[PDB]
Design an enzyme around this catalytic site. Structure first.
Site, PDB file in Angstrom:
ATOM      1  N   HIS C  91       0.959  -1.191   0.169  1.00  0.00           N
ATOM      2  CA  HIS C  91       0.060   0.076  -0.067  1.00  0.00           C
ATOM      3  C   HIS C  91       0.945   1.109  -0.110  1.00  0.00           C
ATOM      4  CE1 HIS C  91      -4.024  -1.818   0.020  1.00  0.00           C
ATOM      5  NE2 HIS C  91      -3.946  -2.437   1.338  1.00  0.00           N
ATOM      6  N   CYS C 133      -0.582   2.229  -4.416  1.00  0.00           N
ATOM      7  CA  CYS C 133      -1.314   3.558  -4.591  1.00  0.00           C
ATOM      8  C   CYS C 133      -0.611   4.685  -4.239  1.00  0.00           C
ATOM      9  CB  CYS C 133      -2.625   3.562  -3.623  1.00  0.00           C
ATOM     10  SG  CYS C 133      -3.968   2.153  -4.293  1.00  0.00           S
TER      11      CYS C 133
END
Lengths: 94, 4, 145
Positions: C91, C133
């Site tokens: 992430h 992301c």
């Protein structure tokens, strides 16, 4: 000539700045799937930034086909690579 | 498809 | 001046490819599991192995452990290597990625390999690959006219 201490970095991002990146629960991420396909096919012959550009195109063709959130359906992703390289980069068989 |  | 000049890729070794693979996170970061990430790790291992890389994987390292490992690799000699590859699968948001327990700014990871910090990679490609992301915008589809 001397070289800058910042030189010869290549930063390969799965998506452009500020965006979500996508991952399939079984096949893996859009970007790594397409990077790996291009590596398999072209890694040993094409220049590496040339190859990364093909990855940009592959990932750009994908879309969120199904999603629990209907507003996310059809959403997209373009990767982004940053080159401070000073020469052509190849991975010809050693 | 999931978000990273 | 040679417009076709290539990096010299005729060293004894291609070099090391590190893969930091993050699937689950400390509960209080409130980050969902990243199913499919081991598929990425394995796919990359095969493709980079086939290109001659010595691939080393680390799974769900805490930030302190990750930073130690990356410092270690930055201080070993790359004199007989063509290049260096470092992959993060995790992430992220802004300009950082997540280790198991905490965010790490990407500049902290790359700074260890700058010319003055890692002499044996001076003049050699230092390649970072980041699946993560980078913010909360979901890009929309358009068509050409």
């Amino acid at each position: 000539y001397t070289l800058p201490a910042g030189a010869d970095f290549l930063m390969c991002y799965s998506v452009a700045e500020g965006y979500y990146s996508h991952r399939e629960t079984v096949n893996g991420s859009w970007y790594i799937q397409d990077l790996c396909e291009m590596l398999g096919k072209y890694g040993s012959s094409l220049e590496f930034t040339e190859l990364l550009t093909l990855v940009n195109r592959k990932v750009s063709q994908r879309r969120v086909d199904f999603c629990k959130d209907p507003s996310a359906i059809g959403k997209k992703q373009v990767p982004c690579f940053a080159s401070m390289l000073t020469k052509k980069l190849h991975f010809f068989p050693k | 498809v999931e978000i990273x | 001046f040679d417009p076709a000049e290539k990096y010299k890729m005729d060293h004894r070794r291609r070099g090391i490819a590190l893969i930091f693979n993050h699937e689950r996170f400390f509960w209080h970061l409130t980050l969902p599991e990243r199913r499919g990430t081991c598929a990425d790790r394995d796919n990359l291992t095969r493709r980079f192995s086939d290109l001659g890389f010595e691939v080393k994987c680390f799974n769900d390292l805490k930030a302190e452990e990750l930073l130690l490992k990356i410092h270690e690799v930055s201080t070993v000699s790359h004199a007989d290597a063509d290049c260096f590859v470092c992959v993060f699968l995790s992430h992220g948001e802004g300009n950082h990625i997540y280790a198991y327990d905490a965010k790490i700014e990407i500049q902290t990871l790359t700074g260890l390999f700058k010319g003055d910090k890692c002499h044996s990679l001076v003049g050699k490609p230092k390649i970072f690959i980041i699946q993560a992301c980078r913010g909360n915008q979901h890009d929309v589809p358009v068509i050409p006219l």
